[PDB]
Amino acid sequence: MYHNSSQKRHWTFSSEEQLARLRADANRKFRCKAVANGDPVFLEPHEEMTLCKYYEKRLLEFCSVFKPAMPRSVVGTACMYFKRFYLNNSVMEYHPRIIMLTCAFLACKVDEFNVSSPQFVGNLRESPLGQEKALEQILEYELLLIQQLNFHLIVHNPYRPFEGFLIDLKTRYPILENPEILRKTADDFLNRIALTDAYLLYTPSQIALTAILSSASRAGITMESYLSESLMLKENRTCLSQLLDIMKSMRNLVKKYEPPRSEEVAVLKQKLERCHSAE
Amino acid sequence: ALYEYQPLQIETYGPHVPELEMLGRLGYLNHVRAASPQDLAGGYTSSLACHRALQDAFSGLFWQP
Amino acid sequence: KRYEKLDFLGEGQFATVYKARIVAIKKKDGINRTALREIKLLQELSHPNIIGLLDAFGHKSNISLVFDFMETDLEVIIKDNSLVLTPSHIKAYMLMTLQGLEYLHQHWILHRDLKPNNLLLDENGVLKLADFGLAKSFGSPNRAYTHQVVTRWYRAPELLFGARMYGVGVDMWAVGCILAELLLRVPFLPGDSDLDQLTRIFETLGTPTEEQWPDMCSLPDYVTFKSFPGIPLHHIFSAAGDDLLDLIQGLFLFNPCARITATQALKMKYFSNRPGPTPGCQLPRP
Ligand SMILES: CC(C)c1cnn2c(NCc3ccccc3)cc(NCCCCCCN)nc12
C-alpha cells in the first residue's frame, strides 16, 4: 500500500528544487567522469530535461500500440521508472532510447504482465536484426535499471485511487449526481499531470483527487463539501488547507509545463548522438 | 502469558475507510461490478475490489514529504 | 561482493541457497521473474513474521537475493520425531503464521505457497513466511490467476476445482492443512493427483453439498463425486480441544467466503484461551 511504500519513503521528494539538484548532480558527475576519461559536446541540465520529456513521450507512444495491450498500470510503472532513472543519471551515459524500452520490459515483468521477449521486441518498429540488437541492449540494461531504481519496483499509480474516489463520490456525495461525468476530463488532467514531476512530488491519492477536482471545476461544480464534509476535514482546518495547497501546486505545475519544441529536440538529439558516438 | 488480539496499527495518512463487511450496508457495492457465481465459488467478492479501491483512494491523501 | 560464502544450504529449481556474512543468499528472458517477484513484494513488506529482504545484486541476467538467515522450518520440526509438539507450541506457530498472514492479506497479497518448509524459524523462534516466488497481489477485478498454485497436499478445493479468481481462502486452507500436519505429524491430505487430492479431501471432510458451497458447480474443473460422509473432526484430531476443533472447522470450511480469514482466526477463542502460545525463545529446536 502507498502509505508504507518505498515510493512514499524514497521516491516522493519535497520540492522541484530538490529534483533539479539531483539532476544537476547527475549532469555534473557525468561531465567529471568524461573529463577524467579524456567541452561543448556536453548537454546542459535543461537540455537533458527536454530530451527526457521527449523520450517519455516516446515511451508512452510505444506502450500505447504495444501488442498484447499493456494495462495502464504497466505503462504508469514504466514511466515512473523512466523518471526515477533520469533523476540520478545523465542521458549522455545511458541512452534514453534503450532505457525507456528497458523500463517497459521491467515494468511488464513487475506488474505480472507476462509477455515473452520475442513479442516484446516484435512490438518494436525495426528489422529482425534491429529487434534482436534491441533485445540484447535491453537485457544488458535490465539489471542496471533495477540497480538505479534501488530495487524499488512497485509503483503506486493514481488510477486505482481514482477508481476509489469515484466509488466514494457515487456512494456518499449525492450533491454530485453522476460522478462518472467527471471521468474523461479528469482522465485528461491525469495524463497532463503525468508529464510533469508531480509523480515524484505528491501521493497518488493527491494526484487522483486533484484530477477529479480540476475536472469538477472545469465542469462548473465545486465539491468543497466533499473535502470538508465527506472527507471530514472540518475537524482539522489545517489538513484542509494543506490539501488545498497541494492541489493548487499541482495545477500550477501543470500550467507551467512546456512540451519540448521540434527544433530544440532535433538539435539536442544530434548532440546526444554525438555524445554517445564520441568517447 | 495469554494471547489477546489487537488490530494492526498502521497509519494510512488519509480518511477512514469503512470496514469491508459494512460496504454492502453503506451502499458502496451498488457502484462496483457484481462478482460472478464462479468468482464467488472461488471466494472472490466485489467487496474485495471495492475495499481495495477505497483504500487506495484514501492512502496518504493527507501526507506531505 | 560485500558478502563471503560460509557454507552451502540448499538447491532449488529456481536458485541455490548459501550462508554468508550472517545472511542467506539465494543465487533471452532476462532477469528471472520469480526473483523479481520476491524483490518487488518483499521491498514493500515489513513485519516480524515475514521474511526480510536485505539486499539484492548480481551481474547481467544473473541475480542474487539476500535474506535474513533462518535456522529451520516447520517441515523439519514436524518430521522430527524427537520433538513433542505441545498445544502451546502449535498455538505459537499458528499465531505467528496468522499474524504474518494478516499483515500480508491487509496489504492485498496472497502467499499461495504455504507449507511447512516455507515457514522458517530463526534462532529466536520467530516464524517468518518465506518463498514469495508464487505470491501475488489480490483484489483487482480484471486480473486472472492460475489454479495450479499451492503444493497439492495443501491446495484448497476451490483451487483443485479450477478457481481462477480467489482470495485469502487459498492461504487459509493451506493454513488449515499445516495445522492438521502439526497435529498429526504427517501430511493431512497426501494426494498423488488433483483427482486423488479432491477424493482425499471429500473422504476425510465429507463431500460438500450445494448448501455449504452454493456455487460449487460453477467452477471450471468441477466434477461430481461420491457423497462421502467424512470423518468427525474429533475422530481425526482426537486430542483437539473444542476451541481448536472450531478453528480447524473454520479453516476447512468448503465455502472460501465462509472460510475464516486471518484476522477472524486470530480473534477466535482458541488463541485467547489457556494455555497461551509458547514464547518464541522456548519453541522446540531440532
Ligand atoms: C529465505 C531463504 C533464502 C532462507 C533463509 N534461510 N534459509 C536456509 N537456512 C538453513 C535451513 C533452513 C531450514 C531448514 C534447514 C536449514 C535454508 C534455505 N534453503 C535450504 C533448505 C534445505 C532444508 C529444507 C528442509 N525442509 N533457505 C533459507
mmCIF file of C-alpha atoms in Angstrom, chain A residues 62 66-71 74 104-123 135 142, chain C residues 28-31 33:
data_model
loop_
_atom_site.group_PDB
_atom_site.id
_atom_site.type_symbol
_atom_site.label_atom_id
_atom_site.label_comp_id
_atom_site.label_asym_id
_atom_site.label_seq_id
_atom_site.Cartn_x
_atom_site.Cartn_y
_atom_site.Cartn_z
ATOM 1 C CA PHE A 62 5.497 2.643 -27.548
ATOM 2 C CA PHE A 66 2.084 -2.462 -27.759
ATOM 3 C CA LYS A 67 0.559 -5.873 -28.534
ATOM 4 C CA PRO A 68 -0.836 -7.542 -26.428
ATOM 5 C CA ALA A 69 -2.383 -4.390 -24.919
ATOM 6 C CA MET A 70 -0.438 -3.086 -21.942
ATOM 7 C CA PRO A 71 -2.542 -2.464 -18.826
ATOM 8 C CA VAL A 74 2.249 -1.241 -16.574
ATOM 9 C CA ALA A 104 8.799 -1.082 -20.344
ATOM 10 C CA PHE A 105 10.421 -4.553 -20.165
ATOM 11 C CA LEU A 106 10.973 -4.424 -16.409
ATOM 12 C CA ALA A 107 7.507 -2.947 -15.826
ATOM 13 C CA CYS A 108 5.846 -5.758 -17.783
ATOM 14 C CA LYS A 109 7.704 -8.257 -15.613
ATOM 15 C CA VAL A 110 6.948 -6.410 -12.366
ATOM 16 C CA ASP A 111 3.228 -5.811 -12.967
ATOM 17 C CA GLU A 112 2.786 -9.516 -13.849
ATOM 18 C CA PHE A 113 2.022 -8.697 -17.483
ATOM 19 C CA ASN A 114 3.633 -11.916 -18.673
ATOM 20 C CA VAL A 115 4.968 -11.500 -22.216
ATOM 21 C CA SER A 116 7.854 -13.273 -23.912
ATOM 22 C CA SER A 117 10.882 -11.317 -25.086
ATOM 23 C CA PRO A 118 10.226 -12.097 -28.794
ATOM 24 C CA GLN A 119 6.767 -10.484 -28.794
ATOM 25 C CA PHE A 120 8.035 -7.550 -26.715
ATOM 26 C CA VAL A 121 10.800 -6.711 -29.177
ATOM 27 C CA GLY A 122 8.470 -7.604 -32.042
ATOM 28 C CA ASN A 123 6.410 -4.622 -30.983
ATOM 29 C CA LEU A 135 16.713 -7.167 -27.114
ATOM 30 C CA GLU A 142 17.814 -4.524 -17.181
ATOM 31 C CA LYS C 28 16.539 -14.102 -23.728
ATOM 32 C CA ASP C 29 14.072 -13.900 -20.843
ATOM 33 C CA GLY C 30 16.285 -11.594 -18.797
ATOM 34 C CA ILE C 31 16.124 -11.499 -15.010
ATOM 35 C CA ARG C 33 10.557 -13.492 -12.887
#
